[PDB]
Amino acid sequence: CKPRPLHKTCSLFMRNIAPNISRAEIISLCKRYPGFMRVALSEPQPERRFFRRGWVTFDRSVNIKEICWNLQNIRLRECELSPGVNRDLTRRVRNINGITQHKQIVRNDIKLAAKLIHTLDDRTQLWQNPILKNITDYLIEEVSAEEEELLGERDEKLIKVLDKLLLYLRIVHSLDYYNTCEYPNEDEMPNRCGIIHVRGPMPPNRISHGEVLEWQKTFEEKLTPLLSVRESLSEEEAQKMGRKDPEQEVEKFVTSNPEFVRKHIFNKHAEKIEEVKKEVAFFNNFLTDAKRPALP
């Protein structure tokens, strides 16, 4: 059997897609070209009135230039797609500061990477994790102090541990560690594993005393946003904005729609009473959230 070029994928890119347009119609539009794989939409942005950036991914054995031309002057629900051929990623393996291959700072990064993996495994609810077994052994210092007391740079053993943690973060949870960012939609987008970040070559001058500690303060400050729990208003603040109670607004639905009429709705029409409760929760989840989408 011939081997397939599954890592390579040519794709389309759409600049402005409307929020009312779902994936369904974009998929079924592009579905009938042979070698179609998957559509990917970005998070909508309030600055452009919540318009999404699309990405229609195709197989390598397909002429994307023809398919990009085919859909060039085609609208979809009062919105011109007008695709452009999304070229492949040139510079994948990017550098960061060369300080990060040091004994003390790698030890710091093993602690933070271990914390991230514990959190992300709980959050996503996988599994326990075999790469997090006896990590505490590598976090502790081990020195010959007594032999100095009586008588008187790279450490690859730590780096090989770190890499298994950092590769897990990147491959599984789509978290590029050194750049300090998530790539949440990667699994739908054309290139599944694109831009990974990597340690620098080496520092030319001496490694300073306080500069190593200053990196660790700055580096941990960038990582803290990535483990941010979703916001919520207080009980009083949420109620003052107008948190609709489920059972109360179910009563408002029944009275608008005497004793024989109430027993008909609860028993026979059991689907409607939950549908109201769902649309109450739909509204309350939007209300409770203290970081809503809104016009700037």
Binding site: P5, P19, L126, I159, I196, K278, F286
Partner: protein, 96 residues
């Protein structure tokens, strides 16, 4: 109190204006939030399998995240995507 009443209007106007749209439904609507997370964990478990496949196979056995082995990382990242798509050891042979 105006500011309190002002934020009620904006919020309720936005809930009306973006009620039936896919992205908004997906974030807050109970049915669509549940069916999103099943897809997410299903697709995430597929990425976990790939990491565990690359471990025992030894695709990062002698592989440090350093620019000296920049070409080796790209070769591994390709092998990761091939396993995500679901290709066998035969399908990896094009990298050799």
């Amino acid at each position: 109190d105006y500011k309190l009443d002002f934020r009620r209007q904006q919020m309720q106007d936005f809930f009306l204006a973006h009620k039936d749209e896919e992205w908004f439904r997906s974030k807050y609507h109970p049915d669509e939030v549940g069916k999103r997370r099943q897809e997410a964990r299903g697709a995430l478990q597929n990425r976990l399998r790939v990491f565990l496949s690359l471990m025992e196979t030894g695709w990062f056995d002698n592989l440090l995240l350093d620019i000296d082995k920049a070409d080796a990382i790209v070769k591994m990242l390709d092998a990761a995507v091939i396993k995500m798509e679901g290709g066998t050891e035969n399908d990896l042979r094009i990298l050799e």
